[PDB]
Design an enzyme around this catalytic site. Structure first.
Site, PDB file in Angstrom:
ATOM      1  N   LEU D 148      51.747  28.772  75.473  1.00  0.00           N
ATOM      2  CA  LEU D 148      51.314  27.554  74.806  1.00  0.00           C
ATOM      3  C   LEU D 148      50.058  26.886  75.343  1.00  0.00           C
ATOM      4  O   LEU D 148      49.738  26.986  76.524  1.00  0.00           O
ATOM      5  CB  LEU D 148      52.465  26.544  74.821  1.00  0.00           C
ATOM      6  N   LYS D 174      55.949  30.141  78.208  1.00  0.00           N
ATOM      7  CA  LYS D 174      55.183  29.653  79.350  1.00  0.00           C
ATOM      8  C   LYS D 174      54.315  28.509  78.847  1.00  0.00           C
ATOM      9  O   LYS D 174      53.396  28.713  78.055  1.00  0.00           O
ATOM     10  CB  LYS D 174      54.263  30.712  79.956  1.00  0.00           C
ATOM     11  N   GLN D 212      50.058  36.956  81.975  1.00  0.00           N
ATOM     12  CA  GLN D 212      49.794  38.378  81.838  1.00  0.00           C
ATOM     13  C   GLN D 212      51.059  39.220  81.788  1.00  0.00           C
ATOM     14  O   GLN D 212      51.113  40.218  81.069  1.00  0.00           O
ATOM     15  CB  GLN D 212      48.902  38.855  82.978  1.00  0.00           C
ATOM     16  N   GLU D 249      46.344  32.509  67.759  1.00  0.00           N
ATOM     17  CA  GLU D 249      45.726  31.401  67.039  1.00  0.00           C
ATOM     18  C   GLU D 249      44.720  30.930  68.081  1.00  0.00           C
ATOM     19  O   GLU D 249      45.099  30.339  69.093  1.00  0.00           O
ATOM     20  CB  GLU D 249      46.763  30.320  66.746  1.00  0.00           C
ATOM     21  N   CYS D 283      41.716  21.836  67.254  1.00  0.00           N
ATOM     22  CA  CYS D 283      40.843  22.756  66.531  1.00  0.00           C
ATOM     23  C   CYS D 283      40.760  22.353  65.058  1.00  0.00           C
ATOM     24  O   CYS D 283      39.688  22.388  64.452  1.00  0.00           O
ATOM     25  CB  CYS D 283      41.364  24.193  66.654  1.00  0.00           C
TER      26      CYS D 283
END
Lengths: 477, 477, 477, 477
Positions: D148, D174, D212, D249, D283
């Site tokens: 997130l 996370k 990761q 996104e 955004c």
């Protein structure tokens, strides 16, 4: 000698052994071009029984194989296009150019429908029960019947049989007694390619006799018919007896709204074309034109000139005419009376308004002005090429008047404002709304009327689905 | 004093000013529990006119807001569950456990339907014309009506009003004259939460008077009714006059096929439960049991014992019974005559078969053996708790006999073989097929009957769509 | 003299002006049949730039017109079927019968995809805001690229270009350097019918050079590739740089479960056919066979005999063989090593297991018994015609072992029990599960792998949608 | 003392036993409000392994039961709304009104997604083979992960977990290291209602370490992440290793086109609101404004005044401000540099343009005029509240400039002309286009970006489907 046609039942043409025949007349000359049997309920039952016997094997065939059969039919139609078009011109009284387009379109439509074979899908639904699968399959109805109108008789054969056959149904069709020749030609093609017997049947006769049996026989899963509201009522009442499903398209009184900010040139062309389609003997066409004050004068002048240029005559001897004769005597008179009532009620004849007298059934394009929304001509399917015009001030007025009708199949509006467009779209209570273009449904669309214009519909995916019913399987563990 | 109920028209209860009333009787004791007006067509028109006046504003509300109104209704129902269940037990004669499940299910169903608000979708179709957009919107029909049966009267209110209201339609409902009390309670809830006036209306009376107006008034876009095939015919015939759309669910004669490789224990439980549902006064239940030779003897013995344990009596004074009385006198007699005809035709009474005489309308569970597929009892909707049994050798026989009926709503089969299952699925011509479980449709399924079992359907996405119609917009440039 | 092929860029064949070429060898004889350029990134960019220039005009064409272009292509392919099949036999090493089926299927597939023109639909969604319309349109991605495998090289051209072009995308394809001839033939057909320049482009070279540019050029909206997991990784990593969408099909290790109650005869035929498809150089084929104890002995015997009859040899000189050579030297050795490791680990060679030495790359059908689920051969895509067999007791064991893999494209099971079937269906974690038949995906299905078998998928409606993206328009008032 | 948070793994909070922690700072005061563990890959694996262990049992639960669990979560959120909103205000720096809307919306979103339980459907496809059923089921992916952003941190938890859980997947989330507090609160709610262990997991740490592992662990079926393009690249590259599916996104540079015939008042309000949303740290907001000559002067004046009124400050001590601080120091500097580069390149500061110095990270709303489409500020995601303006003559210019970007998530246009609207719709290459209203996606829509804005998408039916994969079953006989 006028040919005497046989019926097509259970994979073969059957010669009529009755004494009564029905003459088929060329509406342009009034000459007898052919004769068909005055079929009886008994005849319809034989076709239905054959359709019933063939249905299980037909539905059991993979859909792609049924589509394969449909493609041979359309290929056969293209091979005999000019022959079929002349039959249509001769009995339907429509101009050569329109007949040729109908045949070609019919073949394309059949091909388009065949393409649904591997595409109509059932569904898998989540269940509340652990380990259960809810499977919803799409199955054929069984035996279906089709009652066709004299307007676009060839195409309507396909509009009903293609979707029906593709989905696994068998069918029995009754052409209009006024235009059976093109249907006989279609049956010959079916016979020539060897479609399995019983899948496609053609019975000839009157609505009172053959038509009623097609709607009231308990073995019919669905009756599909296109015609007048009056005839639609009779069909639904008959179907009621056996809870038979119906699919009806009963025409209308298509409203056209021309705003002040409309492309005048485009609007006039669209309306004139729509209306004068097949001499106006069609429903699609705009039959109620609402023009707002600001552009009225201009619009009415151009429309008046556009219509004055429309020439009428024998479709077979003139290919430079935009209009042929009306279907028959009754049609001609109904138009006369409606224009007369209109005039007597206050309507102003700006052009035409006088039925021609002599061989054939012609009515000149007519323009009626100063018509009031109340006038009966605004609430009665006309028939002929008559255009009533009513002025208005607000969009709200126009929409309200467009919706003031028992018919709700098609509508149209011309404007360039974004809000007006979205407002007309949300406000018009019709199955179709054309914006800044002429009325002509696409094969991938859905031609379905609101209110008295019909039940169910035709074309596209939704039209195909009218011929399918669901089977929900609850498979536990 | 038995309460005299008012109708609910245009957002308020209206006191009946007529002299004629209809007594509502407790089928267990024959005592008059309430009275409703002997409504007339005039009354139905007032409700319809109010529904018409409210529809535009109702459809204009965002769907989520309509769903919001539906949720207040179901919340109100849960708050009065026990009260409503007792009303159902009292007038419908169903056992307490079943009544409680019906009320809870009705509230869940309403919530499930409200969830469709932001999910029913229109479509955007590719056009053959450059720059054109074909937009297919899903619109409300307008004013709809619902005619309810006495079987599951409370739930059926929701089965019709929830989908109708969610999609933007307004509605007028007529409860069965035998079970109007639960409908009055539903109307009170609607009044209490303040649903916009005219959106939900309740008119009381007989089918001959009020029912016919609900099916034949030109302002009705669709009439939805659940009942007998006989009454369905009358409704469709009436609707025919104005080309009014119909949605009919007319019951059936649900076939159950028990193979030799079936889980005997499971099958017996499923069949007994299905059949004895609401004393069998339901259609869902298996009413035709086909058992193949190899497992016959065993199956019939267990089934016979299972049914002998079924106790019947007054639902209000016993909560340890699996069956209540039949709805009324006529129902009781029809069952007697059908069992008598069955016996006279050759049927063998293995249990029950004798109507009880005294207060109330009871018929003991009955098992008829050595029945032949030809016997009328296999081709006539029974009513009461009677189970006819027929033996067979092959699956093909069983399927063929299951399909030999004018009804095609529900079917079931018990087996453990993969091919048999897929064969039954493909072979059974029904709207539903239950495999290795009892008959009870899911709210997300689609309860729609084949042949005389109906037209259109209810529940799930497809049920919701019965309340929508399309508007295809051809937007050029 | 071995022909030296040109690339097809921007509507014309372009002669390679480089000094380096790549020899294309007949895997049956090792003879050089042709040469293609050792293309560079620069070449891929020219094709991509041309595709970009042509895309707007291409997407602006009505979908039916794009479908029209696709139909001319498939018609061209049928006209040159035998010529194209020989090219496939010659470079791919597959038998004549298989090559002919691939060409015919490719033409049918292209036609099937063209049919989506008027059918892929966008949606109209209910909004929470009064007067707002939420319109979701389906648009083309833009420029797409395709990297093809040497297995079914001709068909895969269509599997990617047909859906891509139909939806309005333009494409650049890179054939496998081992099988470019059939792609050149496809390009000639495209040139001959006159497809608008830039819509279809063919670039030749190695994956390291040309392939990487097709996956990493910022103008590519999506890269579609079929090949090994190893190569798929490289492609996705490269695409990551520009957030380029990927569509990958990376093969697998298809499990086949044979229960005791299976139709032994049917199962053996299905497995042998699937596996020996294209010498096993395919992924579809069963590569892991699980047989339960009860039927083991019988199954293994018949399977052993069935495989012993399989003859291998030069596809061009024998039409009575079921197997051709492997694609190249590396392939042959990888199979040898895998069988050797298998044997060294405990595997029992019941047939074959010895690579042939001489001109060409042949490996005899091999049957390995007493294999353990742990053995590497059960977790490594094989290549050649090798069938490992593992016994088991319960369905649960078989399912668990089938799911124990990094691949999840295809699976199969043979049984006659209803519960077993539904249990395998729910338990198998694969994109496809075949029941009682051989593995071969339908064009209307959806070939999409789970886990490492891929991302996205191909065929049918869902495959078509991989080439579409949404545009949600919130139109207020 | 600043609280030290535990991770939520396998149904319980786990206390961190490491020595390294990460301070969480209030962006308004720079004070340490809490500490979270500097989690390692090992921690992510424990959460993933627990998710894997719980997934089969979770997917086996009927969908309606999973929806039931989701409803308890949203009910828990509403109960603690103000508490959660303050956590968001405190760590995210967004104003109180916005935080309250985010929490309420998050609860509504979760409920909306739960409603898909009985609605996502698989399909039944017609086969070309006699007696075969092609069944396409929709299955869960398995274990999914979510990374997130700090913008709308609470909502994004639901945007990923609700669709994931509803469809039968388990998840490991996370939160951004800058805004983990609201995620801890969400985890407490999950713990309190007793969601089955392993279904929802929360791991804390940096992207380099924990992030990761969430993208590269072979047991992850799909990684979903929202953030910058830079971070998206790293995630896709990592996923490439195991062919892990991604859902990204990555924000954008939302273009706003104001035509001369636009409702000036409406447009200015929409743009100012969109942009100043969460101080512009979002955004969605318009970040590129194109105004045509004819209305330029007027538009720029009103916009300038509208922005001058925007007050900024500590969200916790002022509820009369429309803007809070930027997320952190790095964000503040990036905005400074971008405005400085803009000015140095020719941009004209009409308002603001000077970073505030002192406690917290504030940047005043800024208006840059005389900006050229070439200026880097038009091709670089800004961050802060800066509005660049460019004039143009034709719609074609505006559309062309709007499409000149590597981002393609959102766009908007204001006009009243029908053709302009339809032209912008067809011409704009974005996942969303708002017309005559402000930018804010609906939960039933589909928020999916074109080009570098993302892969896959969120919300509505299509968003739900990102968490489903198909299993095509070919059932023969």
């Amino acid at each position: 000698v006028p040919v005497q046609h046989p019926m097509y039942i259970d994979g073969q043409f059957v010669t009529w052994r009755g004494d009564a025949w029905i003459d088929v007349v060329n509406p342009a000359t009034e000459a007898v071009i052919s004769r068909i049997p005055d079929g009886q309920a008994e005849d319809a039952r034989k076709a239905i029984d054959a359709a019933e016997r063939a249905q299980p094997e037909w539905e059991a065939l993979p859909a792609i194989e049924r589509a394969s059969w449909l493609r041979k039919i359309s290929a056969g139609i293209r091979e005999r296009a000019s022959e079929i078009s002349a039959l249509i011109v001769e009995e339907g009284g429509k101009i050569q150019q329109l007949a040729e387009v109908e045949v070609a379109f019919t073949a394309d439509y059949i091909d388009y429908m065949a393409e649904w074979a591997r595409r109509y899908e059932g569904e898998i639904i989540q269940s509340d029960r652990p380990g259960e699968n809810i499977l919803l399959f799409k199955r054929a109805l069984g035996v279906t019947t089709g009652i066709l109108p004299w307007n676009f008789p060839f195409f309507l054969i396909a509009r009903k049989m293609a979707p029906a056959l593709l989905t696994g149904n068998t069918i029995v069709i009754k052409p209009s007694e006024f235009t059976p020749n093109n249907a006989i030609a279609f049956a010959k093609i079916v016979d020539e390619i060897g479609l399995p017997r019983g899948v496609f049947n053609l019975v000839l006769g009157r609505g009172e006799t053959v038509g009623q049996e097609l709607a009231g026989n308990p073995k019919v899963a669905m009756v599909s018919m296109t015609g007048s509201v009056s005839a639609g009522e009779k069909i639904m009442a008959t179907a009621a007896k056996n809870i038979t499903k119906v699919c009806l398209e009963l025409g209308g009184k298509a409203p056209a709204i021309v705003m002040d900010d409309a492309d005048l040139e485009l609007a006039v062309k669209a309306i004139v074309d729509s209306r004068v389609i097949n001499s106006g003997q069609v429903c699609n066409c705009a039959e109620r034109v609402y023009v707002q004050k600001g552009i009225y004068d201009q619009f009415v002048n151009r429309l008046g000139e556009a219509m004055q240029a429309v020439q009428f005559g024998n479709p077979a001897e003139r290919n430079d005419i935009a209009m042929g004769p009306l279907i028959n005597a009754a049609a001609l008179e109904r138009v006369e009376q409606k224009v007369a009532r209109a005039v007597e009620e206050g309507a102003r004849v700006a052009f035409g308004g006088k039925a021609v007298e002599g061989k054939g059934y012609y009515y000149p394009p007519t323009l009626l002005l100063d018509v009031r929304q109340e006038m009966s001509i605004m609430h009665e399917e006309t028939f002929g090429p008559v255009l009533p015009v009513v002025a208005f001030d607000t969009l709200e007025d126009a929409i309200s008047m467009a919706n003031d009708s028992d018919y709700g199949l098609t509508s149209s509006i011309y404007t360039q404002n974004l809000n007006v467009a979205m407002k007309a779209i949300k406000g018009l209570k019709f199955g179709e709304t054309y914006i800044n273009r002429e009325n002509f449904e696409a094969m991938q669309g859905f031609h379905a009327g609101w209110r008295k214009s019909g039940i169910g519909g035709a074309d596209g995916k939704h039209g195909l689905h009218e011929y399918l019913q669901t089977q929900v399987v609850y498979l536990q563990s």
